[PDB]
């Protein structure tokens, strides 16, 4: 996929979300993160009246 195409040789900048990782930071090189992502939760509408 995208990472594979980068490491192929014919791409230079993966401007996209990339969800940095411990081990994913060896065969490529990163920069200063510019947003924060985390696994969140949603629930169905639970806002009635009295």
Partner 1 sequence: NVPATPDGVEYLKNDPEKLDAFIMDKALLDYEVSIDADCKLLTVGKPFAIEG
Ligand X SMILES: N#Cc1cc2[nH]c(=O)c(=O)[nH]c2cc1[N+](=O)[O-]
Binds ligand X (CB under 6 A): choice among 8, 13, 15, 19: 19
Quick check: 17 binds partner 1 (CB under 8 A)?
no
> How many chain residues interact with ligand X (CB under 6 A)?
3
Give the span between the Cα atoms of 45 and 6, in whole angstroms: 42
- Stretch touching partner 1 by CB under 8 A, among 4-12, 13-21, 30-38, 39-47: 30-38
Is the distance from CB of 11 to CB of 5 less than 8 angstroms? yes
Q: Given the complex with ligand X, which of 41 and 47 has the nearer CB atom?
A: 41
Among left, alpha and beta (phi > 0; psi -120 to 50; other), residue 39 is: beta
């Amino acid at each position: 996929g995208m990472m594979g195409e980068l490491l192929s040789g014919q791409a230079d900048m993966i401007v996209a979300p990339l969800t940095i990782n411990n081990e994913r930071a060896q065969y490529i090189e990163f920069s200063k993160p510019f947003k924060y992502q985390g696994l969140t939760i949603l629930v169905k509408k639970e806002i009635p009246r009295s």
